[PDB]
Amino acid sequence: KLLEHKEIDGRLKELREQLKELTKQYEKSENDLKALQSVGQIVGEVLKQLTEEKFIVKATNGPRYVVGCRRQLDKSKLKPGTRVALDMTTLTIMRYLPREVDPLVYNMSHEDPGNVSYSEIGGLSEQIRELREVIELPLTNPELFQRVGIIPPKGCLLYGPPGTGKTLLARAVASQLDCNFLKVVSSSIVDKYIGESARLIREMFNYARDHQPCIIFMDEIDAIGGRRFSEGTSADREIQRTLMELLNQMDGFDTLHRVKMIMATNRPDTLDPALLRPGRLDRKIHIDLPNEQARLDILKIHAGPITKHGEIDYEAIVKLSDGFNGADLRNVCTEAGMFAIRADHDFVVQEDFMKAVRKVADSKKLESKLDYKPV
Amino acid sequence: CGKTMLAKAVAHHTTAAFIRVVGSEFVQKYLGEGPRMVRDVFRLAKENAPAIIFIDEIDAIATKRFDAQT
Amino acid sequence: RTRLLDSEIKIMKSEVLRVTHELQAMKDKIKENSEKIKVNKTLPYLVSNVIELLDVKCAVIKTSTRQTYFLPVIGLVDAEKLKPGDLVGVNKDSYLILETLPTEYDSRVKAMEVDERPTEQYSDIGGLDKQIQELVEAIVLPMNHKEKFENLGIQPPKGVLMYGPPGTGKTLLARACAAQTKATFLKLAGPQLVQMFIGDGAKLVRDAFALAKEKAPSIIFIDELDAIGTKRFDSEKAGDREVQRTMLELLNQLDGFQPNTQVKVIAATNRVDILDPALLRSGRLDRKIEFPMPNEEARARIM
Amino acid sequence: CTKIINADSEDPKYIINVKQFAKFVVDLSDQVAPTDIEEGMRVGVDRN
Ligand SMILES: Nc1ncnc2c1ncn2[C@@H]1O[C@H](COP(=O)(O)OP(=O)(O)OP(=O)(O)O)[C@@H](O)[C@H]1O
Ligand SMILES: Nc1ncnc2c1ncn2[C@@H]1O[C@H](COP(=O)(O)OP(=O)(O)OP(=O)(O)O)[C@@H](O)[C@H]1O
Ligand SMILES: Nc1ncnc2c1ncn2[C@@H]1O[C@H](COP(=O)(O)OP(=O)(O)O)[C@@H](O)[C@H]1O
Ligand SMILES: [Mg+2]
Ligand SMILES: [Mg+2]
Ligand SMILES: [Mg+2]
């Protein structure tokens, strides 16, 4: 009978399993035994080409060198401008490389999983169609402009009082592109080195030409914008150099095409007239305090998931809401539950809303109330 | 007022070599790169041709006040 | 029983191969670990930053001697757990990455953290029981009844502001709440966020809200906010600008693009008209409570 | 002489910093205890 042969296989197959799994722990650890012999390579840049073999480079360290190559590495393809790798010891060219993508901008491109939409914004749909006209319409249908004979605008800015939705409106656009939408906080781009503030604005807009349908968003430009000076401190010397690098990359000696720019500020009083020029910023979109129909709309957006009882007169809340923002109407929906959070009412009565308005209404007695005007 | 525009039209109908630099790029990070970056522009305008240099936004370079401590 | 002696010969031969199999892996680990500890006793690690991770599986790093390098072979760390912007430990001579270093925190932010728990109790604070309540419930309740705000369903309030005359007790609540909740309390001075070099005060703010991002129960305290929060102004020929940069990030790093509900901000000034209205909007600083002078009965209670 | 950023758990593995040059991962000598090598402290360090 072969039944005693199946009993003997339970030891041999358990013996051959101790050969493969124990050597697999020696397999991967043998990869590191010879992976520790590769040597790093100097990253350089090709300047010109003297002869077939005489090349001339400059590292990203310092001095300029005269260098050779391997005889197999496509010497016709090392154009003056490309980025290459070198040898450390003999200092020769090993390998051509593509461009670099400077990880401040990689961590600027696609780190937003935010999923807000045009349904959440309310009250300013006139400007939403206005803002769509520069970033969505000629990107899909360019021929109508070519038939009339004018060029679509480069970029536009958004100004208004604080808390009307200038940041929110760009987040609606941000959930549409997801790969070539560049949002900038306009204060991460500055550091204490010599030219590193101006290297980013070069290399952001170099990344914009590589992904041709693309949007640049520039929030709170009053950090980097400024007017100019008669040179008071030594800090704003090299900010105006960072600022004049921005002005040139917009409309100096370049077909600024398919690269749209959206900018936002609380006060445009402090902006350089060279930057509010109609060559660089084309349209000026004014966002205001919400109307009573708009205050009706914004309130209903934020009163969605509120477990209430159906007696809510939305008119009287708007009737008291005078000169409010789009932001404190979120506060009223927030603070109405703060009266429900005492006395343990899991619902929200209609009475707490008129309580909620009258506490917000006098807390903004201490505001400044200056509208603002771009000049 | 057509400052950059008139320089475009000159660089289109010219027959001479045209060298076009942005004047906020001489401030490199490493020391000494900038003065090397100046002197080989004019050397390249020397060896090449009866050329033309264009430099824009000289306010990035030529200011009035300085400070020899930073 | 005929094939039982032939199948036992196949079992006894393969089982003897297992004795040489465990001896094969027991012998392979000496020569591999003799060089593995060799590159570990190259313990000086020239730390760097991963610039980009190639595909033609390769990477470009920038050492903190301002030197960039290309490597064809990555090393002891694989390519999956890495990303551009990380900071690793690199061999000196081979320039080969070895470990993965955790975090990047300024030591001035580490001084901001309390580890002392300054004990004060609410009975030491007489005559402010309206203000005591709405400070606690606007901070402590989103830390201990998270579902209670989600039972109804609202966003909880974010950011409080206390203001008034200078002797009315504003630090005194902040030292009270540091003794009550057992969370990450983190304190700030007003003019601490002002630096000589540019961008350092801006970098110092985002390090604090990233450190309080890490400790997910945490509240952050700012004392004398009018040092940085002074109202902006348009002027030619002169004027400070650099202090506005630290404010304009503190606007953004608090509220705006990529919001979060994990940290709570407590701000304390004594003059309000100095402040920029961009940080009194509604959403950056929500609850603006005032501390009046004691009327009559609190003065009996205080002394 | 240098300046220490931080320690880490389970190991000495100290992160160090110098004036303009890089940051290293270092170790003690035998002559000093790991007690008074607290974080944010200037220490003297050999050149090799
Ligand atoms: N029209 C609106 N509809 C719905 N919500 C709004 C509207 N306007 C503002 N909000 C609310 O206000 C909050 C703040 O929005 P946002 O930050 O965009 O204001 P802002 O215009 O950017 O002000 P600032 O530029 O000063 O930051 C958002 O959470 C948003 O929910
Ligand atoms: N004949 C013209 N004269 C002046 N401006 C014109 C003329 N035709 C067109 N323009 C407009 O003037 C704009 C500005 O061109 P240009 O950039 O040369 O001005 P500029 O003086 O260099 O301004 P800036 O120095 O701020 O760039 C052009 O984009 C063009 O739209
Ligand atoms: N019940 C109380 N009400 C008001 N102030 C008090 C009370 N008890 C003590 N104090 C005093 O108030 C001081 C708190 O200072 P504070 O007014 O917060 O300074 P500032 O407001 O300028 O930061 C403490 O020194 C304390 O002695
Ligand atoms: Mg905003
Ligand atoms: Mg011009
Ligand atoms: Mg105080």
Swiss-Prot record, chain B:
Localization per Swiss-Prot or TrEMBL: Cytoplasm; Nucleus
Transmembrane feature ranges: none
Subunit organization: Component of the 19S proteasome regulatory particle complex. The 26S proteasome consists of a 20S core particle (CP) and two 19S regulatory subunits (RP). The regulatory particle is made of a lid composed of 9 subunits, a base containing 6 ATPases including PSMC4 and few additional components. Interacts with NR1I3. Interacts with PAAF1. Interacts with TRIM5. Interacts with ZFAND1.
Function, in words: Component of the 26S proteasome, a multiprotein complex involved in the ATP-dependent degradation of ubiquitinated proteins. This complex plays a key role in the maintenance of protein homeostasis by removing misfolded or damaged proteins, which could impair cellular functions, and by removing proteins whose functions are no longer required. Therefore, the proteasome participates in numerous cellular processes, including cell cycle progression, apoptosis, or DNA damage repair.
Record family assignment: Belongs to the AAA ATPase family.
Protein's UniProt name: 26S proteasome regulatory subunit 6B
UniProtKB/Swiss-Prot annotation, chain C:
Changes after translation: Sumoylated by UBE2I in response to MEKK1-mediated stimuli.
GO molecular-function terms, A-Z: ATP binding; ATP hydrolysis activity; identical protein binding; proteasome-activating activity
Disease link: Deafness, cataract, impaired intellectual development, and polyneuropathy: An autosomal recessive disease characterized by early onset of deafness, cataract, severe developmental delay, and severely impaired intellectual development. Patients later develop polyneuropathy of the lower extremities, associated with depigmentation of the hair in that area.
Protein name: 26S proteasome regulatory subunit 6A
Keyword Secreted among record annotations: no
Family: Belongs to the AAA ATPase family.
Main location: cytoplasm
Gene that this sequence comes from: PSMC3
Assigned keywords, A-Z: Acetylation, ATP-binding, Cataract, Cytoplasm, Deafness, Host-virus interaction, Intellectual disability, Neuropathy, Nucleotide-binding, Nucleus, Phosphoprotein, Proteasome, Ubl conjugation
Oligomeric and partner information: Component of the 19S proteasome regulatory particle complex. The 26S proteasome consists of a 20S core particle (CP) and two 19S regulatory subunits (RP). The regulatory particle is made of a lid composed of 9 subunits, a base containing 6 ATPases including PSMC3 and few additional components. Interacts with PAAF1. (Microbial infection) Interacts with HIV-1 Tat.
Annotated binding of ATP, by residue: G164, P165, P166, G167, T168, G169, K170, T171
Organism: Homo sapiens
CC per GO annotation: cytosol; extracellular region; ficolin-1-rich granule lumen; membrane; nucleoplasm; nucleus; P-body; proteasome accessory complex
GO biological process: blastocyst development; modulation by host of viral transcription; positive regulation of proteasomal protein catabolic process; positive regulation of transcription by RNA polymerase II; proteasome-mediated ubiquitin-dependent protein catabolic process
Cellular localisation: Cytoplasm; Nucleus
UniProtKB/Swiss-Prot annotation, chain D:
Post-translational modification N6-acetyllysine, affected residues: K19
Post-translational modification: Monoubiquitinated by RNF181.
Record's subcellular location: Cytoplasm
Induction conditions: Expression is not cell cycle-dependent and occurs throughout the cell cycle.
Family: Belongs to the AAA ATPase family.
Summary of subunit composition and partner proteins: Component of the 19S proteasome regulatory particle complex. The 26S proteasome consists of a 20S core particle (CP) and two 19S regulatory subunits (RP). The regulatory particle is made of a lid composed of 9 subunits, a base containing 6 ATPases including PSMC2 and few additional components. Interacts with NDC80/HEC; this interaction is detected only during M phase. Interacts and SQSTM1. Interacts with PAAF1. Directly interacts with TRIM5.
Role description: Component of the 26S proteasome, a multiprotein complex involved in the ATP-dependent degradation of ubiquitinated proteins. This complex plays a key role in the maintenance of protein homeostasis by removing misfolded or damaged proteins, which could impair cellular functions, and by removing proteins whose functions are no longer required. Therefore, the proteasome participates in numerous cellular processes, including cell cycle progression, apoptosis, or DNA damage repair.
This protein's name: 26S proteasome regulatory subunit 7
Organism field: Homo sapiens
Section of the entire sequence shown: 98 to 145 of 433
